[PDB]
């Protein structure tokens, strides 16, 4: 309801001046001494000056939308500066894809009883995945920590036997070992995971984030399909991250690249631990959803990660990991009942907010990300997307994802700073000259002399 005008000599400069400015298109609307800048003002002020309602040019931001899980797929917006356009994205949660589940396990010494139970769970895990959806695959990998002091005792006897001295079937400490490529054969899991021995190390936080990064950075060795990707992270206390490597004089940052050699992370002592945010980024890119299976005392700590890795869940693991199959089923339900609607990086000439109209009884408005919980299969929820431009922008685009899924909404952003007026037909004989008539003002073909040609 307000308009500040500085340079206006055309209808397009009027719209550019602000969202509250409007333009009269009446013919012969201007007096002899007046400019055609009087033709651009707020709606009530124009009406004050004798312009009729139908001659008021007042563009409005518009959205053109063109069985799926994410609809619509393509949207074109027309943004005049300062006014948002709104369109609704519908999320109708479909039936689940097949599930790849890579089981990444702590093998420090307190996990000895857990290891004996997990060695026998290959059958139950596949049967659990096939009770959820169709055609499941399972994999396995293990981790302890970096193999430099003070994370491990580097005394040669304690490298050969990091476990307490009684222990007789113990492997030297290691950073990460890829044991089993994703497979639907449970007997392969049994004989491959059965070959693994318990290990040990020196300090309580472990290097599992090293292993998670190598899992997310080596998709060909791990064997991810383009289906649902779950990464179970099973441990019973804390985790190292970037900055801790300094104690071992490891100062080079993690480069987020694959470094598997002979299914081992050999160069682990050349790189620092990844930062949580670095890992969250890598997991989102590759659509890998971690399931932190942790003991009761660690649950509150690992739950803080779900703050930072949106598609993740935490479940309380027993001291012997005997409940892990029900842990994974519960975690799947929590993972898939939560739906985030996000967009990729934007130019700062644009702003996007989300309204989340959820079926569980909840409504969020004007948020940087859409968020609904309690989403059910075949029960649609609605996200209202609002996009605002601060200026006349160049043609652009950006994509809207549902986190964890590959479906996208491609939003083509187009400026609407042009006025869309009328035909100079019925008015020809024109300006008493050569020039043509646009929007009630004559823009004379360059020269002769005159505004009125």
């Amino acid at each position: 309801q307000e308009c500040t005008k500085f340079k206006v000599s055309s209808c397009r400069e009027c719209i550019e001046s602000g969202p509250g400015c409007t333009w009269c298109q009446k013919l012969n609307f201007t007096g002899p001494g007046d400019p055609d800048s009087i033709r651009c003002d707020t709606r009530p002020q124009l009406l004050m000056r004798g312009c009729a309602a139908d001659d008021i040019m007042d563009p409005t931001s518009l959205a053109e939308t063109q069985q799926k899980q994410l609809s619509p797929q393509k949207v074109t917006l027309y943004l005049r500066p300062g006014q948002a356009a709104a369109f609704n994205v519908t999320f109708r949660r479909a039936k689940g894809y097949p599930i790849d589940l890579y089981y990444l396990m702590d093998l420090s010494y307190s996990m000895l009883d857990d290891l004996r139970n997990v060695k026998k769970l290959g059958g139950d895990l596949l049967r659990a995945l096939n009770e959820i959806t169709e055609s499941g695959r399972i994999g396995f990998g293990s981790f302890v920590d970096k193999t430099v002091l003070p994370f491990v005792n580097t005394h040669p006897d304690k490298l050969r036997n990091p476990c307490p001295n009684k222990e007789k079937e113990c492997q030297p400490p290691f950073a990460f070992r890829h044991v089993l490529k994703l497979t639907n054969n449970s007997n392969q899991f049994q004989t491959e995971v059965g070959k693994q021995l318990i290990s040990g190390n020196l300090d309580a936080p472990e290097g599992g984030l090293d292993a998670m990064m190598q899992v997310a950075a080596c998709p060909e060795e791990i064997g991810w399909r383009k289906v649902t990707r779950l990464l179970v992270f099973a441990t019973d206390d804390g985790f190292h991250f970037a900055g801790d490597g300094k104690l071992g004089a490891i100062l080079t940052p993690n480069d987020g690249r694959c470094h598997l050699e002979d299914n081992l992370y050999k160069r682990s002592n050349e790189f620092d631990y990844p930062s949580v945010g670095q890992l969250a980024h890598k997991l989102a890119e590759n659509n890998i959803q971690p399931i932190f299976a942790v003991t009761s005392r660690m649950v509150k700590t690992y739950e803080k990660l779900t703050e930072i890795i949106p598609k993740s869940a935490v479940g309380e693991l027993s001291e012997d990991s005997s409940n892990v199959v029900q842990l994974i089923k519960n975690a799947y339900n929590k993972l898939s009942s939560r739906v985030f609607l996000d967009h990729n990086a934007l130019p700062d000439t644009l702003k996007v907010t989300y309204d989340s109209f959820c079926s569980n009884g909840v409504t969020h408005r004007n948020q940087p990300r859409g968020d609904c919980d309690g989403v059910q299969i075949n029960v649609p929820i609605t996200f209202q997307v609002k996009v605002t431009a601060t200026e006349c922008i160049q043609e652009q685009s950006f994509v809207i994802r549902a986190l964890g899924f590959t479906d996208i909404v491609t939003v083509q952003v187009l400026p609407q700073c042009e006025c869309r007026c009328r035909d100079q037909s019925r008015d020809r004989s024109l300006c008493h000259g050569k020039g043509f008539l646009e929007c009630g003002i004559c823009r004379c073909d360059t020269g002769y002399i005159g505004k009125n040609c």
């Binding site: 580097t154 300090d203 930062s275």
Partner: protein, 583 residues
Amino acid sequence: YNLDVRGARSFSPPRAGRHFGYRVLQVGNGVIVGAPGEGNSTGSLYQCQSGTGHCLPVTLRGSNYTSKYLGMTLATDPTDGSILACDPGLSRTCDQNTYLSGLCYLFRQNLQGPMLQGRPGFQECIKGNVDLVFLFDGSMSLQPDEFQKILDFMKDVMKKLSNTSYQFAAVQFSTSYKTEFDFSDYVKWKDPDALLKHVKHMLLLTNTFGAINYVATEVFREELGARPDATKVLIIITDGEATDSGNIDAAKDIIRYIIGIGKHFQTKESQETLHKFASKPASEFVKILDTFEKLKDLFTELQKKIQDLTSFNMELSSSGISADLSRGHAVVGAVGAKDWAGGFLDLKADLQDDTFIGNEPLTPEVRAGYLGYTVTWLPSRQKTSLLASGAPRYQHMGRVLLFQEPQGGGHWSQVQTIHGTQIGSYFGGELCGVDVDQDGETELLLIGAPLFYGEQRGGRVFIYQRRQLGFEEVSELQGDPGYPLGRFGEAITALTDINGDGLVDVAVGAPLEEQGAVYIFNGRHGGLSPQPSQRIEGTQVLSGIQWFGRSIHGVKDLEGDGLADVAVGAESQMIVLSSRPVV
């Protein structure tokens, strides 16, 4: 925009490793650069000359050890020009265990001058096999009940250690020395009451030098039952000062505790006289007891302190992983203390003694918190001087503790806790104190959280201001967005005054923003400016550069042209920029 990027100079030795530039420090006409080694290389320090443009490796004079860690820790004292360098990679094996602590070097004048060294938080190796000798005072000052209590102390120590690999010997000393039983005499009996039942009180002088030389040459003998594979330990028990003089060089390989008991060690001056007899640090090996009945209370401290470790005190202390000097006082952090709860060591000026200050109380929640990862003095003149230390891993979130200097005859006390909010952000992984108006009161504590994630900004720097009740969060130093993993905050330094307005300015390194960047925040009235006045892309100074801004140091420079010189570390590079009134 007072840093002349067009005039930047760069330094790099021909054999520089990737971590040349991990620390930078400006001393008259030079930059000192810490260069921790990568791979199999050992670390070193480089002295870079402003005139020649060359960097040369520093030869540590009288140093017995250099690990890859050397170069990790460089600090300078603004009040007196001291330089402290630390190598927190002193590793050693004790039976099947490995220990890891620091070696620190103090250059009082310059790197070419005299050097002092010490091992803060050093744990001596006590093996399974221990040959322990009691050397007990029998001087004329001891009343019979006091002499007896000395006898009973040695008995309870032998009794509590009876089923261990320890073997014992005992020597009375006064004017002369008598072996009351050898190691073989302990093996054949293991009865303390029998081994000492022939002991007769000598009732003469106190010849401590000769006694110790006697023990080292006449008691630790293989033909008397001494095992050459065992740790040699000596426990001296005396009630007065030594009546002779000389040296105990013949006993320097022995771990020596000494216990001064009674009225003759009332003064701190007399207690000081026992330090030459014991091992270092005197805070560990010199025990002063005011009464003879406290020989019972000492049973735990001198025996529980005396192999498969699953829980560690100072054996993996990692001392010297950080340092800071103020007003001649040095402290180094020790993140490994108390199962990586952490803490810091208050160093004596000659580096020959230290005092550990840590979390209090030791709760299970401080474990693996890495307190002492950062240590920063916060000196004041009218108000009390403080020390800030970050535990960037506290509960996987981090926190910062404020300690107050000992006031009067008091001790270090912990006066405030500052909590981080985001897991993995490394809240407290970098700290910096700033006295902006230069009134002599350091009012600003800057806390880096360089791993902070979210809102398209990587890393944060928060501004805390000292109020009557403690430090309150007043603002944040805003870095540019668009680098979600850029590690804004990894380096924070006060530059002194670069734009000639009298207010101190701050630099903030962001080493993973593309090839690295440095932000400059000008001091204003009442604090720091939240928006930067300049951002320096590393790509602008050198084209093949990385990690620009990993370390920063600023000083008013006395030679050269410009108001201030700023040194910035990068991967295998060190860059010097001059501050100018008009750029």
